[model samples]
Target chain A: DIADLRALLDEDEAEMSVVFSDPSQPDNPAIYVSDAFLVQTGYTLEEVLGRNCRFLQGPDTNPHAVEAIRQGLKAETRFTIDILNYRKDGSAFVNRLRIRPIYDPEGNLMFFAGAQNPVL
Target chain B: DIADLRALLDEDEAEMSVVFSDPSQPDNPAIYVSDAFLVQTGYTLEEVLGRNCRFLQGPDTNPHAVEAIRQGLKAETRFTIDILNYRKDGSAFVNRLRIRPIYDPEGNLMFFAGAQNPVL
Candidate 1:
């Protein structure tokens, strides 16, 4: 089941991963991403996914990813892009990401998949 | 241009065209995807230097697509998925998409290309 996780870290340009919870637990709505999740934040998915990641989206968080997500959600859809994000430690970072909606065998919405990108 | 967009909904597929920016607005992100943008996003690629292509994991999304561009970086990877993405009108729609990272001559992350599947 971690195959997607491996596929994420295996890319050359991408960095983070946002795994929506099986239910949206701790706080970081996304389950986990990758190293770019570190960037200047200095935290790891191990340290963050179980909590809220808004700490990373400081006053300067890009309106792109959030807006995109909102747009996707309002429509109950998926999207992809390059935007900005923060880290567990409140550091600024640039993120290029692609997102999509996942569905289960019963045609039910399963989860969201997001692949983050490394900085330029 | 019409060929690719037509491919998105057609049987087989189309060839190529280009629509990098939205002629409809200033920084409106993107306006027209080629017939192939529709195609590849659905099946086409006058892309690479002139297109956008992604994949449908069937049940997967390239996780690298989730990271902050600076967090989850890698070299070269492959992913496939069938997703529920949105339509231009901010409506919900399902598309089967596939994507590959753009590697420049020196092997660098450049851009992305995707094809949306009408039926998987």
Candidate 2:
């Protein structure tokens, strides 16, 4: 049943970009990414998967927002913030990002879901 | 790993609404719905789960769009269309919906993912 649910999410076409990261792993590398995310960041799945999402941050990215996200991860809590992110082409966008911790039915921490929408 | 992925999706906060339905079931009932879906449809999880999404269709809903979705499901294909859907409060919204069949690694059909964004 869990496999079925994961398969379903793989085909999701939500307008916002989405990514799943395994917190159990070392840098919280991305495990899955939505198609919309690939389009938004101009990166292929191969390039994004198994890598930490910090690659999206550039020199212009807000340090405060980055620190907030770092704190949220440390606390295993949910948070929303606007941060500057760079695409493959080096173009920047204001991303409204929401990160939430996901727990399994057994109450074990599994992954972190990061959803992003571009802010004008 | 699949359970972890599913748990991640459960916490997604994408801007667009999303739902997963079991196509193997009698009526393709919803098995999961994103939080944004609850806000957009004004329906609680108990109200939408185990029910076919057809309930959202009202008199003014576009027949062609409905037919396209029907054909897409029958063929286990993917499609996108705009249809009028009703919220729990009886308010109508033009929903740009995309439905895609999810297949497991073994190539078995698992579920259908429906993602919707309200059109102005």
Candidate 3:
């Protein structure tokens, strides 16, 4: 059943940019990204998969926001924040990022789902 | 490997409403839906998963748009169209639906990714 669920989600075409990261791995490296995310960040699947999303942080990115995100993940809590993030082309934008912990039917934490939206 | 990939995608929190359907199954039933999708359509995961998205269609839904979606899926091509869709509470909204065919590295069809945005 998980396999079938995964097949469906891997092909999701949701409009909102999103990325999934594995906490089981060091640094919570990304394991999956949506097509909209690739377009928004201008990164290929190969470039982002298995990498920490901190690659998007830039000089102007608020350290406080980063710390907040770090703490949220450490605490396994849902959080929403706006932080400056960079695209692959070196452009900057305010990303309204929301992170939520996903759990299995048995209530076991599986992955962290990060949903991103650009704040115009 | 597929299992790992599935685990990552099953928890996606992409802000854009999205759903994945299995073409191999009759009526192309949904296998996965994003939380944003659940919010937009006012349906629970238990209510939508394994069901046809056409359940969202109502009398106001355009037949031509529906036919275009059918033809595009049959042709395994990407398509975008707007059609009237009903929420679980029977409210109607214009859903700008986009469909894309997903394939594996070996070029095997896997699923259909349908992204939806409400047209205000």
* Model 1 DockQ class: incorrect
- Interface RMSD, per-candidate values to 1 decimal: 16.0, 9.1, 10.6
lDDT tens digits, residues A1-120, model 3? Answer: 112323324233256688777675678887777788999999888888778999989999999999999999888888899999999999999999988786533234557888888999
Score candidate 1 by lDDT.
0.42
Evaluate every candidate with DockQ and list the scores.
0.02, 0.04, 0.02
In model 1, where do residues sit more than 4 Å from their true spots? A1-20, A23-28, A39-41, A62-65, A88-90, B1-120
Q: State the fnat of candidate 3 relative to the true structure.
A: 0.00
By TM-score, rank the candidates, best first. 2, 3, 1
What would the per-residue lDDT of candidate 2 be over residues A26-116, giving only the tens digit for each residue?
7988877778899999999889878899999999998988999999988888788999999999999999998878754334565787888
Chain A TM-score of each candidate structure, as shown: 0.62, 0.88, 0.87
Which of candidates 1 and 2 is the stronger one according to lDDT? Answer: 2
lDDT of 3 by residue, B1-51 (tens): 112322324233256788877675677888777788899889988888778
Question: What docking class should model 3 receive?
Answer: incorrect
lDDT of 1 by residue, A33-104 (tens): 455545446775456554544455667767766776657654646566666676655555776665566543
- State each candidate's clash count: 77, 0, 1
* Candidate 1 structure quality by residue, lDDT tens digits, B7-114: 122233234333322111222122235454444334323222222122222234345543322132233343444456543334444554443343322232323333
What C-alpha lDDT do the candidate models reach, one value each?
0.42, 0.76, 0.76
